[PDB]
Amino acid sequence: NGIVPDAGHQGPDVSAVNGGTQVINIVTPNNEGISHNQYQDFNVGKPGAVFNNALEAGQSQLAGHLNANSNLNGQAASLILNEVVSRNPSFLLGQAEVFGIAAEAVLSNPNGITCDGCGFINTSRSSLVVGNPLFENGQLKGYSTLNNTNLLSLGKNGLNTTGLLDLIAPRIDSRGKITAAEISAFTGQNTFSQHFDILSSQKPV
Amino acid sequence: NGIVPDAGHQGPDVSAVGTQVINIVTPNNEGISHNQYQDFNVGKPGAVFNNALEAGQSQLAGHLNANSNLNGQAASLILNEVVSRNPSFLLGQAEVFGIAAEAVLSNPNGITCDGCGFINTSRSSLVVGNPLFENGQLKGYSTLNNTNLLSLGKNGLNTTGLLDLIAPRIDSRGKITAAEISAFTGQNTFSQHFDILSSQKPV
Amino acid sequence: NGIVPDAGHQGPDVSAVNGGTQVINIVTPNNEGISHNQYQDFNVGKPGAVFNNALEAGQSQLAGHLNANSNLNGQAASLILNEVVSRNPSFLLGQAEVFGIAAEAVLSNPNGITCDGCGFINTSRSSLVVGNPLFENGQLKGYSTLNNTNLLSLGKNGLNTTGLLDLIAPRIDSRGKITAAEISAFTGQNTFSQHFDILSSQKPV
Amino acid sequence: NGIVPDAGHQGPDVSAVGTQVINIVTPNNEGISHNQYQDFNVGKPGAVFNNALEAGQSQLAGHLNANSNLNGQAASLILNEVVSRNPSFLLGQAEVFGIAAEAVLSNPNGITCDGCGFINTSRSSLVVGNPLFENGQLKGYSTLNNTNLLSLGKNGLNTTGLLDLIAPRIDSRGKITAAEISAFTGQNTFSQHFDILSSQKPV
Numbered sequence: 001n002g003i004v005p006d007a008g009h010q011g012p013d014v015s016a017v018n019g020g021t022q023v024i025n026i027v028t029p030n031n032e033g034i035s036h037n038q039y040q041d042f043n044v045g046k047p048g049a050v051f052n053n054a055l056e057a058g059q060s061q062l063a064g065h066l067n068a069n070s071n072l073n074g075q076a077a078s079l080i081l082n083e084v085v086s087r088n089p090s091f092l093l094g095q096a097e098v099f100g101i102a103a104e105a106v107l108s109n110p111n112g113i114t115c116d117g118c119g120f121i122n123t124s125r126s127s128l129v130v131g132n133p134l135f136e137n138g139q140l141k142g143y144s145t146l147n148n149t150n151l152l153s154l155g156k157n158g159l160n161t162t163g164l165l166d167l168i169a170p171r172i173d174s175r176g177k178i179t180a181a182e183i184s185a186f187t188g189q190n191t192f193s194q195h196f197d198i199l200s201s202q203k204p205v
Numbered sequence: 206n207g208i209v210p211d212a213g214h215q216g217p218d219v220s221a222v223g224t225q226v227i228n229i230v231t232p233n234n235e236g237i238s239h240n241q242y243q244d245f246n247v248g249k250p251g252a253v254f255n256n257a258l259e260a261g262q263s264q265l266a267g268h269l270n271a272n273s274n275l276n277g278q279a280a281s282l283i284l285n286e287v288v289s290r291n292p293s294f295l296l297g298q299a300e301v302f303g304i305a306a307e308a309v310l311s312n313p314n315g316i317t318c319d320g321c322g323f324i325n326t327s328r329s330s331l332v333v334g335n336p337l338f339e340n341g342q343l344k345g346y347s348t349l350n351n352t353n354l355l356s357l358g359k360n361g362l363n364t365t366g367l368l369d370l371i372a373p374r375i376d377s378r379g380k381i382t383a384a385e386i387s388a389f390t391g392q393n394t395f396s397q398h399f400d401i402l403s404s405q406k407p408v
Numbered sequence: 409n410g411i412v413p414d415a416g417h418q419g420p421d422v423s424a425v426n427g428g429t430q431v432i433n434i435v436t437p438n439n440e441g442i443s444h445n446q447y448q449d450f451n452v453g454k455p456g457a458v459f460n461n462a463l464e465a466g467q468s469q470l471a472g473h474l475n476a477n478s479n480l481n482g483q484a485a486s487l488i489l490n491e492v493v494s495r496n497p498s499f500l501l502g503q504a505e506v507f508g509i510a511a512e513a514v515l516s517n518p519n520g521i522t523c524d525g526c527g528f529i530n531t532s533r534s535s536l537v538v539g540n541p542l543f544e545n546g547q548l549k550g551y552s553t554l555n556n557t558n559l560l561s562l563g564k565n566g567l568n569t570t571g572l573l574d575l576i577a578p579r580i581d582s583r584g585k586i587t588a589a590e591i592s593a594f595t596g597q598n599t600f601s602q603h604f605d606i607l608s609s610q611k612p613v
Numbered sequence: 614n615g616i617v618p619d620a621g622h623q624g625p626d627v628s629a630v631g632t633q634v635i636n637i638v639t640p641n642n643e644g645i646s647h648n649q650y651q652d653f654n655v656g657k658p659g660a661v662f663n664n665a666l667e668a669g670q671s672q673l674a675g676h677l678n679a680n681s682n683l684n685g686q687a688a689s690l691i692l693n694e695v696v697s698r699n700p701s702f703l704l705g706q707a708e709v710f711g712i713a714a715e716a717v718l719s720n721p722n723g724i725t726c727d728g729c730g731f732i733n734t735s736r737s738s739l740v741v742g743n744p745l746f747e748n749g750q751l752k753g754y755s756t757l758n759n760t761n762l763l764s765l766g767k768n769g770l771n772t773t774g775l776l777d778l779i780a781p782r783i784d785s786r787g788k789i790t791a792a793e794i795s796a797f798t799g800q801n802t803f804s805q806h807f808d809i810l811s812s813q814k815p816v
Binding site for chain 1: 233234235236258277278279281282304305307328342343365366367384385396397398400
């Protein structure tokens with residue numbers, strides 16, 4: 001309910017289980033392992049959210065027993081790309097868990113992202129991008145925060161993840177603790193590779 | 206030389222460049238590339254699991270081609286199972302070239318890590334134990350009826366990814382660097398995600 | 409009450425505040441910053457424990473407002489060394505917080521240490537040593553697990569800290585997640601420097 | 614050259630070896646060595662705060678003597694306060710030689726970190742703001758009535774210890790490596806432990 005998929009082929013199925021935890025059945029990844037999910041809304045409440053990246057049934061940490069994600073056809077996602085395509089900013093107030101095969105997770109929302117006690121579980125790398133993914137010939141090429149003044153805001157209850165965290169936004173505000181192994185933080189209006197290497201920058205004249 | 210595949214359908218093709226390149230076997234419908242070996246040892250030059258659909262640049266072995274054993278899909282979990290009585294010695298890095306994946310090494314005879322590590326691996330696991338199958342599907346792992354050791358040597362273990370260490374006993378003389386470390390000792394059975402499902406105790 | 413100081417000059421004062429959280433007024437450090445505390449019992453319950461390493465009053469995370477530690481005379485501890493001198497093994501089931509000036513914290517208990525949901529807050533380095541500190545001419549020289557078969561046991565709820573964690577014991581058992589930046593783990597019967605570099609080893613003949 | 618002490622009782626003695634060695638001032642009864650500067654800039658050779666009671670080997674500056682400004686006690690918190698209008702540029706490592714301590718750099722004019730880091734520092738803090746005193750005791754910090762920037766450059770920031778980053782605004786183009794990172798932006802006042810006590814907002 002805080003997570004509302006886009007209508008087309010890139011909108012994943014969203015359900016909820018006991019406690020309110022939302023379960024996202026991510027869309028079929030391409031052959032490079034990218035599951036490109038599109039949303040009208042992407043907000044995570046205190047009950048948290050689970051990306052079902054599992055090819056067999058099992059036990060998730062936030063949502064109990066889940067079956068396999070029937071959208072996966074012999075390959076799990078290696079990168080779970082979550083892209084908000086409406087004007088609605090994102091509010092992340094609980095944990096997002098990758099259930100099944102560990103993967104990288106990206107949330108892009110050019111309207112703004114606020115993380116207050118948010119977090120990522122079973123993810124090798126996590127990225128919050130106040131910006132858009134860039135595509136060419138249908139392949140992910142990187143990310144853009146060009147022509148954007150919106151904000152990535154880390155609230156008092158902070159952000160908890162493992163491994164690599166990318167924080168990519170025109171502006172970044174913070175009011176608490178950021179738990180991760182390394183943080184790559186890039187402010188300003190820029191374009192980036194898929195690995196968040198900076199490729200170009202837009203500067204006032 | 207250090208990595209020797211086993212003769213059957215589940216033996217990958219292995220060559221050197223001393224860095225060894227393993228063209229892992231085709232993954233099954235659960236995303237598992239199940240590779241079996243008579244020996245699995247990584248030297249200082251390291252090893253590369255070729256999980257690539259297009260040619261490209263590997264960190265440890267230079268420029269490599271696609272793995273033709275894959276039929277249009279990369280593996281999701283690369284399972285490397287030693288089926289002989291030979292323990293594993295890991296003295297260099299193991300890299301997944303191509304599409305990142307999880308990797309597991311199972312060797313019920315013992316595993317020694319001394320300067321080993323994992324590259325481009327979302328979650329890596331070292332299991333002094335055996336995988337459990339049922340209907341040809343991976344069900345978990347077993348350290349039952351086993352007293353062998355996972356040993357971490359002076360030069361330690363490094364990965365930027367998630368790490369699980371599973372063995373009847375663990376010895377250590379060095380540093381473990383990982384995004385997250387789960388370690389489980391004793392004689393147990395496990396799910397695929399290393400939840401302990403049962404434990405074996407003396408009378 | 410789970411923490412019982414030794415009687416002599418190296419026994420710190422222990423009190424409890426709302427919820428049961430214990431507050432340790434660590435003994436005066438020497439000039440090198442080592443506060444050498446000795447205990448008959450060192451057990452931390454789910455309510456947690458706080459080392460008062462503060463030279464001014466302030467707000468602790470686990471125990472509310474605390475006054476300055478009157479044992480400190482113009483210098484806080486740089487290393488809080490907690491040494492169990494009885495035969496009683498330690499059970500750590502909650503967080504240990506350093507209140508005041510951040511410091512290194514060491515618990516040595518040659519009888520055994522079990523950590524099940526234990527953790528360290530505001531510590532630059534944390535060490536659990538199933539072994540004894542070594543002293544010469546009244547100075548800390550390092551640590552010993554010689555002539556010891558006892559166990560460091562990490563339970564299902566795991567261990568959470570920041571930065572460097574040393575796990576030093578004849579045997580180490582584990583059943584869960586160990587959260588830290590790096591873990592230096594040394595099994596066997598050994599002697600170590602103050603920085604946990606191995607100096608010697610005892611091996612069966 | 615990059616670090617210039619201020620003329621009074623609270624100006625430390627500063628020399629080079631290009632690595633600069635700062636013999637910080639005597640700590641007060643709350644353990645604070647309060648040092649004031651007309652300039653505080655660290656170059657690629659780095660800087661050393663001498664917090665030692667005995668001679669010994671520093672990582673960045675070779676063999677150094679005890680800091681005679683200490684009267685038998687090392688500092689607990691090393692507070693480095695820029696009192697001029699000059700921003701700080703940190704392009705190398707700052708090391709506490711001797712007894713580990715916390716370190717704070719306050720410069721309300723701006724701080725730029727580009728390859729900077731902290732060694733042997735239990736908790737380090739960069740504050741684009743001023744310390745607050747009351748009765749000559751440190752009470753906290755203030756970023757009020759300030760629009761200046763903490764900027765993290767391409768070469769990033771590294772420490773094995775705890776880190777606080779406090780500024781009206783933070784810009785970044787690189788990686789932060791620390792045991793724990795707390796970051797607080799905006800116009801605020803803080804306690805000594807960086808709990809926000811108040812905030813300044815436009816009408």
